[PDB]
Design an enzyme around this catalytic site. Structure first.
Site, PDB file in Angstrom:
ATOM      1  N   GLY A 144      60.569 -70.126  85.317  1.00  0.00           N
ATOM      2  CA  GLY A 144      59.697 -70.444  86.398  1.00  0.00           C
ATOM      3  C   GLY A 144      59.871 -69.656  87.559  1.00  0.00           C
ATOM      4  O   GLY A 144      58.977 -69.020  87.925  1.00  0.00           O
ATOM      5  N   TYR A 224      75.653 -65.417  77.190  1.00  0.00           N
ATOM      6  CA  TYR A 224      74.842 -64.498  78.073  1.00  0.00           C
ATOM      7  C   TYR A 224      75.741 -63.049  78.633  1.00  0.00           C
ATOM      8  O   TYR A 224      74.950 -62.112  78.620  1.00  0.00           O
ATOM      9  CB  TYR A 224      74.633 -65.281  79.417  1.00  0.00           C
ATOM     10  CG  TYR A 224      73.206 -65.987  78.937  1.00  0.00           C
ATOM     11  CD1 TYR A 224      72.180 -65.531  78.341  1.00  0.00           C
ATOM     12  CD2 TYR A 224      72.779 -67.264  79.693  1.00  0.00           C
ATOM     13  CE1 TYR A 224      71.027 -66.169  78.016  1.00  0.00           C
ATOM     14  CE2 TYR A 224      71.800 -67.976  79.268  1.00  0.00           C
ATOM     15  CZ  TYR A 224      70.886 -67.592  78.497  1.00  0.00           C
ATOM     16  OH  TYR A 224      69.627 -68.141  78.461  1.00  0.00           O
ATOM     17  N   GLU A 254      58.177 -40.113  86.884  1.00  0.00           N
ATOM     18  CA  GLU A 254      58.298 -39.312  85.438  1.00  0.00           C
ATOM     19  C   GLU A 254      58.191 -40.293  84.430  1.00  0.00           C
ATOM     20  O   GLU A 254      57.932 -39.981  83.280  1.00  0.00           O
ATOM     21  CB  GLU A 254      59.496 -38.558  85.478  1.00  0.00           C
ATOM     22  CG  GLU A 254      59.400 -37.226  85.946  1.00  0.00           C
ATOM     23  CD  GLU A 254      60.543 -36.273  85.715  1.00  0.00           C
ATOM     24  OE1 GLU A 254      61.486 -36.151  86.495  1.00  0.00           O
ATOM     25  OE2 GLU A 254      60.579 -35.639  84.545  1.00  0.00           O
TER      26      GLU A 254
HETATM   27  N1  LIG Z   1      69.594 -61.698  78.205  1.00  0.00           N
HETATM   28  C1  LIG Z   1      69.520 -62.572  79.061  1.00  0.00           C
HETATM   29  N2  LIG Z   1      68.559 -63.666  78.929  1.00  0.00           N
HETATM   30  C2  LIG Z   1      68.668 -64.614  80.018  1.00  0.00           C
HETATM   31  C3  LIG Z   1      69.556 -64.698  80.972  1.00  0.00           C
HETATM   32  N3  LIG Z   1      69.690 -65.878  81.662  1.00  0.00           N
HETATM   33  C4  LIG Z   1      68.609 -66.404  81.218  1.00  0.00           C
HETATM   34  N4  LIG Z   1      67.676 -65.791  80.300  1.00  0.00           N
HETATM   35  C5  LIG Z   1      66.573 -65.996  79.410  1.00  0.00           C
HETATM   36  O1  LIG Z   1      65.443 -66.446  80.555  1.00  0.00           O
HETATM   37  C6  LIG Z   1      64.897 -67.490  79.922  1.00  0.00           C
HETATM   38  C7  LIG Z   1      64.941 -68.575  81.175  1.00  0.00           C
HETATM   39  O2  LIG Z   1      64.676 -68.118  82.220  1.00  0.00           O
HETATM   40  P1  LIG Z   1      65.546 -68.066  83.374  1.00  0.00           P
HETATM   41  O3  LIG Z   1      65.838 -66.839  84.282  1.00  0.00           O
HETATM   42  O4  LIG Z   1      66.779 -68.619  83.246  1.00  0.00           O
HETATM   43  O5  LIG Z   1      64.648 -69.045  84.567  1.00  0.00           O
HETATM   44  P2  LIG Z   1      64.741 -68.711  85.953  1.00  0.00           P
HETATM   45  O6  LIG Z   1      64.152 -67.305  86.505  1.00  0.00           O
HETATM   46  O7  LIG Z   1      65.887 -68.912  86.793  1.00  0.00           O
HETATM   47  O8  LIG Z   1      63.545 -69.761  86.716  1.00  0.00           O
HETATM   48  P3  LIG Z   1      64.006 -71.343  86.838  1.00  0.00           P
HETATM   49  O9  LIG Z   1      62.936 -72.138  85.969  1.00  0.00           O
HETATM   50  O10 LIG Z   1      63.463 -71.885  88.320  1.00  0.00           O
HETATM   51  O11 LIG Z   1      65.289 -71.664  86.448  1.00  0.00           O
HETATM   52  C8  LIG Z   1      65.333 -67.524  78.686  1.00  0.00           C
HETATM   53  O12 LIG Z   1      64.373 -67.249  77.804  1.00  0.00           O
HETATM   54  C9  LIG Z   1      66.948 -67.297  78.689  1.00  0.00           C
HETATM   55  O13 LIG Z   1      67.036 -66.856  77.208  1.00  0.00           O
HETATM   56  C10 LIG Z   1      70.784 -63.737  80.987  1.00  0.00           C
HETATM   57  O14 LIG Z   1      71.619 -63.887  81.646  1.00  0.00           O
HETATM   58  N5  LIG Z   1      70.504 -62.875  79.908  1.00  0.00           N
END
Ligand SMILES: Nc1nc2c(ncn2[C@@H]2O[C@H](COP(=O)(O)OP(=O)(O)OP(=O)(O)O)[C@@H](O)[C@H]2O)c(=O)[nH]1
Ligand SMILES: CC(=O)OC1=C(c2cccc3ncccc23)Oc2cc3ccccc3cc2-n2cccc21
Ligand SMILES: Nc1ncnc2c1ncn2[C@@H]1O[C@H](COP(=O)(O)OP(=O)(O)CP(=O)(O)O)[C@@H](O)[C@H]1O
Ligand SMILES: Nc1nc2c(ncn2[C@@H]2O[C@H](COP(=O)(O)OP(=O)(O)O)[C@@H](O)[C@H]2O)c(=O)[nH]1
Ligand SMILES: [Ca+2]
Ligand SMILES: [Mg+2]
Ligand SMILES: [Mg+2]
Ligand SMILES: [Mg+2]
Lengths: 435, 330, 428, 54
Positions: A144, A224, A254
């Protein structure tokens, strides 16, 4: 020297930011306390690494980074982690409650109340810049905050820094490690609203990183941390040219010049090699790692480049690599594999070599290697990922499932179809180019 | 227990395949748009290959090779053979062909004038001894056509003095093993071949002019009979005189596109069934006419062939709880 | 720090409520005096979700006990963990509600609701970030049903942007206190449809059948039923109160589980099914936990899931197990029985794991299902309601409190709308 | 096949190898969006409070 500011939004952007900045400090010899014994100009610098680090009168090297998350859990571990001393408190921005996996809640409801704070913090880093190139924005599609607030921040950056470039590093959603059932919704909403504001975006599909960690690192259930140390290697490969002396991709402009002939089609496919398990007793050659860039199993997004058309290719080598060995591999690869380009583009490969071999986190999962390559190729084949994603959107939206959560945040339902229609344009743009 | 969907109802080959799979009790059929499938009997046109191989915990398999159409379209088959160093100009089993749009007009004309027997054939269906007649008929239509040398001296079956063409069914599995069904079929002409209906044998075209039917049932002669004829008439076998060349052309064509359609290192797996169509001339030379990406079968061999598909193509990846094919090695 | 304010109303709501607090108090190493005597500080990381710290390092539940007679709440205060509750948070009258929704909702309950709201307001205003409320209650009585839904309507008015969650006990003739339980339940379901985000439907018919058929209990008591309720409530809150759970909260559960605002009535399940005082010594395998939690005989709602389809599913495994095996075991369920999952919501099954197991089980799994088969529960209540209402039987108990027949007609119509709505999405 | 623009230096080198020649919203507009969403939020909430008042 021209500085770059990295903005990390949401959990994915913050944790990947931790992986990257940790690796930068290892690659540049900067201690967790910011002290850099190699740097001989204290308090000032015109060096290549000063595009990402500033310097204090006490010799402390401070990242040109801001971390933003709507909830404090993820940034607090950065505040108390092993690199707490690196960043100063003003660079870390948190709220009290997250976006609940709701694009609308990150963009409209919660975004409006913190957007101005984040910009001012950003402005305070730009003040310390004698020549700002632009920003590098790390975020996820499915979160989100990563989807919703990021799109809003990209809208305002275009306003407050119209001249500057903006590059995205985006995490594409995968069921294997996903979080919310509505991640396709958030992905399309943020891609629609961010398209005109991003000059070049590198998508990373968690499915690809997850499968690479299973096959090549022999990790049964990747975490993660496993994914981010690998993603950070790729991000290091892509930014090294901005941080080390060199002649290819020396500024953010670039990246667009060499990888994005068509503005809307600005999602280069990234391929990396080699990924070697740490707990192991073979050193791949230049031909071998170059040929590996054309295997689907090594791509940041799973798809088949044999069935698309190339618009641009970049080869970024690190380690023991000499030009002659690169051309011997290319001519050898061009024959056996079909690398069809578009008629209005030359069959060309821009090459960059950095002599320092890849750095790997001490005790991590990746073994140290004598030479590595990261290929950036703008292929129409990446449109497969847009199609996959747009189909999942079509399945839910056909019943209007979960829409009430977005409308309840003040978003109109029409923004959904307006977003989907933009994505349908994107797909046809790819098809006209790929024929 | 395994799962499969169906997205081509018109297919007669895979209607039988689905029926056999269900019978085994270890396969369950799902709705067309259900992503939790192991096997997919996809559609002929624009199959969504991009959505395969992204289901955690699901090995997925489909009955088509993406990109194998370059072999099964006349314009592209000609192009494949001209621009492939693996084929022409060393290729001697494909009739001299040119692709002209309603290139390669100039090159075709030069070959025709230079030859000035000159009887050609244009298809996408005209046969003329004058080059000018073919093109006037081509420009009328809006579809690309290929001009090809009509085989003036075809091998004739006696009695009857009639033309014929050979259909060979070939199956390629996920490992890219090339399997040739041991049972072929000749599609013969009831009308006796006349140098100046009887010139084209497509069965369907044969019912239009039902001159004769049950020399053979449905104008179909199988190998056991055809082999006996070759022995009695020409003192040769079907294996030596014709099959050696068929196996070579089949191998030649599929090994050419192998690196472009192989799914060895892909997230999903592919197999496909092809219908090769050959001509045979007076001197027992085999000519490759066309390759069909979605062929039908002869009623007499439906059961045996469809069973073999399940055995080598499906159960090989999804095993359950002497062969009828000839493996062409490479 | 996302606090939850817990409310328990009426006899049933306070009995399961009390059982819930002593169970999770033991899981966090909190003794009956409110002092922590645990071994791992993983118990304390998110202890604030349900506990206040106060002074002396004594954790006090963020709980409010409501009832219209003092009987059940005297029993709580007499109980072992009765001393743990803040005494100011006992709010009760003397008149009673006599198993009469009208008395709880319009007359007797109205006299006392403002006092409850004063305690709610006190707890909420000392929250760093209040995420919402959870209410335990039954629907067949008067106080938890009639006054419970009155509280919910008034809480929403004062905290319109907080999550409202309930643990609602559905009546059954198999475990009936009075003949008017269908009237009270129908009137309450209409409130729950409008004013909750998530309701865990806990059917006394299912709890009884589990105690009789699976647990081989000839004459089950409320204590036995509440033991099943206790284990369920612990399971469906594990992710809210232990660390490393992706910051799971009430709102994210509602966002992902509820594709349509009215269809927010969850089917809970639990495995292994265990009787009180009946402890077994072989732990279940991950295959076994997975099969049983999807089995109808482990559902607390008394609906056959094979009679409908899953809109969404959340499951939580508790213990030291192979997560890779947990993944494979969940994937095969969806891949094996993909017909019982709506195809128009991709990846609608979420799996969580917690290393800390509940008391007396080396591992367990809890199921939260949003299934269209729940319509079977509302159809059951609807038929009972209508059988009496077509003769206006027992209505004078309600018209004597100021209610009109029209208000019954409207609750009946809304529940039938709810039923036909679930059947709408069973088409797909 | 062909190499051009070879740049060397201490840290490494880069070059290009050719194989075939070729054949705006304003700041206030964003406010008119964010504020339009906030008003729809407050309208829908007033419909709720008024409903509860009934
Ligand atoms: N590769 C990778 N993907 C991540 C990581 N943390 C979350 N994701 C991916 O990000 C998506 C979830 O979004 P988040 O970044 O965790 O959510 P947010 O931006 O904190 O927004 P909120 O809904 O408020 O929690 C999912 O597809 C997860 O698989 C990470 O540390 N590494
Ligand atoms: C996955 C996790 O670790 O927690 C979550 C739980 C959860 C799971 C099980 C029991 C619970 N009990 C109470 C609160 C949450 C849960 O809901 C969810 C249910 C879901 C159900 C279907 C699809 C996605 C879901 C996501 C969540 N979701 C999004 C962020 C965090 C959580
Ligand atoms: N160059 C050539 N020389 C001799 N005969 C030819 C020929 N080209 C086509 N034919 C004749 O026509 C038939 C092959 O037609 P063709 O294969 O082009 O049509 P088609 O592809 O639509 C039928 P299919 O469904 O098997 O692909 C045979 O009967 C053969 O006798
Ligand atoms: N599961 C369970 N159900 C109960 C319990 N006590 C009462 N009930 C049920 O709740 C209904 C009676 O309502 P009750 O809570 O006693 O009335 P209230 O005091 O007015 O809230 C009937 O359906 C009973 O079967 C209990 O401890 N456990
Ligand atoms: Ca310096
Ligand atoms: Mg978050
Ligand atoms: Mg043919
Ligand atoms: Mg009672």
């Amino acid at each position: 020297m021209r500085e770059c500011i990295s903005i990390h939004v949401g959990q994915a952007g913050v944790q990947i930011g931790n992986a990257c900045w940790e690796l930068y400090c290892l690659e540049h010899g900067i201690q967790p306390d910011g002290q850099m014994p190699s740097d001989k100009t204290i308090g000032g610098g015109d060096d290549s690494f000063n595009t990402f680090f500033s310097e204090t009168g006490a010799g402390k090297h401070v990242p040109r980074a801001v971390f933003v998350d709507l909830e404090p859990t993820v940034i607090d571990e950065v505040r108390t982690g092993t690199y707490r001393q690196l960043f100063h408190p003003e660079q870390l921005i948190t709220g009290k409650e997250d976006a609940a996996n709701n694009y609308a809640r990150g963009h409209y409801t919660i975004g409006k109340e913190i957007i101005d704070l984040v910009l001012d913090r950003i402005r305070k880093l730009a003040d310390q810049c004698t020549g700002l190139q632009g920003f590098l924005v790390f975020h996820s599609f499915g979160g989100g905050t990563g989807s919703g607030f990021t799109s809003l921040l990209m809208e305002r950056l275009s306003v407050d820094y119209g001249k500057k470039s903006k590059l995205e590093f985006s995490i594409y959603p995968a069921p294997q490690v996903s979080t919310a059932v509505v991640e396709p919704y958030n992905s399309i909403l943020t891609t629609h609203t961010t398209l005109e504001h991003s000059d070049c975006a590198f998508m990373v599909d968690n499915e690809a990183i997850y499968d690479i960690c299973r096959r090549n690192l022999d990790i049964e259930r990747p975490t993660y941390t496993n994914l981010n140390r690998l993603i950070s290697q790729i991000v290091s490969s892509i930014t090294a040219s901005l941080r080390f002396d060199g002649a290819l991709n020396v500024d953010l402009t670039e990246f667009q010049t060499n990888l994005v002939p068509y503005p809307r089609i600005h999602f280069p496919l990234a391929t990396y090699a080699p990924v070697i398990s740490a707990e192991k007793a073979e050193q791949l050659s230049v031909a071998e790692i170059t040929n590996a860039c054309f295997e689907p199993a090594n791509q940041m997004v799973k798809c088949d480049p044999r069935h698309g058309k190339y618009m641009a290719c970049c080869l970024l080598y690190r380690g023991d690599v000499v030009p002659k060995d690169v051309n011997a591999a290319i001519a050898t690869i061009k024959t056996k594999r079909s690398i069809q380009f578009v008629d209005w583009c030359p069959t060309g490969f821009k090459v960059g070599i950095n002599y320092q071999p890849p750095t790997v986190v001490p005790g991590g999962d990746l073994a140290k290697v004598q030479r590595a390559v990261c290929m950036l190729s703008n292929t129409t084949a990446i449109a497969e990922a847009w199609a996959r994603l747009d189909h999942k959107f079509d399945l839910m939206y056909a019943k209007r499932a979960f829409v009430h959560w977005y409308v309840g945040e003040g978003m109109e339902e029409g923004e959904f179809s307006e977003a989907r229609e933009d994505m349908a344009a994107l797909e046809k743009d790819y098809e006209e180019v790929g024929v | 227990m395994y799962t499969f969907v169906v997205r081509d109802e018109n297919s007669s080959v895979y209607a039988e395949v689905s029926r056999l799979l269900l019978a085994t009790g270890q396969w369950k059929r799902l709705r067309k748009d259900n992503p939790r499938f192991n096997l997919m009997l996809g559609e002929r046109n624009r199959l969504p290959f991009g959505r395969l191989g992204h289901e955690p915990g699901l090995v997925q398999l489909v009955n088509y090779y993406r990109g194998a159409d370059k072999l099964c379209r006349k314009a592209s088959l000609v192009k494949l053979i001209k621009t492939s160093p693996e084929l022409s100009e060393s290729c001697t089993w494909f009739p001299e062909s040119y692709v002209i749009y309603p290139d390669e007009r100039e090159v075709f004309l030069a070959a025709y004038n230079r030859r000035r027997g000159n009887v050609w054939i244009a298809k996408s269906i005209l046969i003329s001894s004058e080059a000018s007649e073919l093109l006037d008929f081509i420009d009328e239509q809006g579809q690309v056509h290929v001009i090809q040398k009509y085989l003036e001296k075809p091998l004739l079956l006696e009695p009857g003095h009639r033309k014929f063409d050979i259909r060979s069914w070939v199956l390629v599995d996920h490992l890219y093993n090339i399997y040739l069904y041991r049972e072929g079929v000749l599609r013969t002409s009831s009308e006796p071949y006349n140098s100046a209906t009887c010139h084209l044998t497509n069965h369907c075209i044969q019912k239009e002019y039902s001159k004769n039917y049950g020399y053979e049932e449905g104008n179909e002669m199988f190998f056991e009979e055809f082999n006996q004829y070759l022995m009695d008439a020409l003192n040769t076998t079907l294996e030596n005189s014709i099959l050696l060349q068929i196996k070579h052309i089949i191998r030649s064509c599929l090994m050419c596109i192998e690196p472009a359609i192989s799914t060895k290192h892909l997230h999903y797996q592919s197999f496909q069934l092809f219908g090769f169509d050959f001509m045979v001339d007076e001197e027992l030379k085999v000519w490759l006419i066309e390759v069909n990406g979605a062929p039908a079968c002869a009623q007499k061999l439906y059961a045996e062939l469809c069973q073999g598909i399940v055995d080598v193509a499906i159960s090989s990846v999804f095993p359950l709880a002497t062969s009828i094919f000839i493996k062409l090695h490479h | 720090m996302r606090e939850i304010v817990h409310i328990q109303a009426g006899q049933c709501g306070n009995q399961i409520g009390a059982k819930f607090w002593e169970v999770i108090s033991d899981e966090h190493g909190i003794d009956p005096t409110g002092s922590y005597h645990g071994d791992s500080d993983l118990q304390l990381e998110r202890i604030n979700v349900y506990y206040n710290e106060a002074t002396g390092n004594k954790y006090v539940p963020r709980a409010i006990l409501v009832d219209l007679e003092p009987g059940t709440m005297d029993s709580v205060r007499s109980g072992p963990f009765g001393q743990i509750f803040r005494p100011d948070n006992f709010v009760f009258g003397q008149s009673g509600a006599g198993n009469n929704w009208a008395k709880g909702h319009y007359t007797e309950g109205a006299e006392l609701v403002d006092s409850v709201l004063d305690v709610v307001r006190k707890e909420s205003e000392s929250c760093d970030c209040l995420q919402g409320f959870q209410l335990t209650h039954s629907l067949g009585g008067g106080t938890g049903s009639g006054m419970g839904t009155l509280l919910i309507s008034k809480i929403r008015e004062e905290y319109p942007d907080r999550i409202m969650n309930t643990f609602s006990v559905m009546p059954s003739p198999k475990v009936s206190d009075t003949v008017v339980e269908p009237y009270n339940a129908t009137l309450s379901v209409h409130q729950l449809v409008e004013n909750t985000d998530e309701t865990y439907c806990i059917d006394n018919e299912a709890l009884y059948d589990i105690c009789f058929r699976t647990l081989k209990l000839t004459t089950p008591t409320y204590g036995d039923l509440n033991h099943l309720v206790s284990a369920t409530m612990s399971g469906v809150t594990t992710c809210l109160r232990f660390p490393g759970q992706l910051n799971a909260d009430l709102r994210k559960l509602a966002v992902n589980m509820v594709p349509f605002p009215r269809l927010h009535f969850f089917m809970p399940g639990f495995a292994p099914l265990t009787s009180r005082g009946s402890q077994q010594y072989r732990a279940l395998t991950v295959p076994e936990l997975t099969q049983q939690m999807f089995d109808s005989k482990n559902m607390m709602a008394a609906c056959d899931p094979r009679h409908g389809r899953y809109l969404t599913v959340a499951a939580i495994f508790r213990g030291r197990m192979s997560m890779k095996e947990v993944d494979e075991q969940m994937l095969n369920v969806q891949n094996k029985n993909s017909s019982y999952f709506v195809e128009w919501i991709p990846n609608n099954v979420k799996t969580a794991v917690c290393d800390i197991p509940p008391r007396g089980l080396k591992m367990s799994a809890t199921f939260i299902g949003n299934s269209t088969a729940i319509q079977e529960l509302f159809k059951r209540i609807s038929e009972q309601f209508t059988a009496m209402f077509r003769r206006k039987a027992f209505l004078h108990w309600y018209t004597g409190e100021g209610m009109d027949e029209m208000e019954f007609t409207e609750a009946e119509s809304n529940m039938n709308d709810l039923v036909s709505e679930y059947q709408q999405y069973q088409d797909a | 096949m062909e190499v051009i623009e070879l740049n060397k230096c201490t840290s490494g080198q880069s070059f290009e190898v050719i194989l075939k020649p070729p054949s705006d919203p304003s700041l206030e507009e964003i406010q008119k969006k964010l504020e339009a969403a906030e008003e729809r939020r407050k309208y829908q909430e007033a419909e709720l409070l008024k409903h509860l008042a009934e």
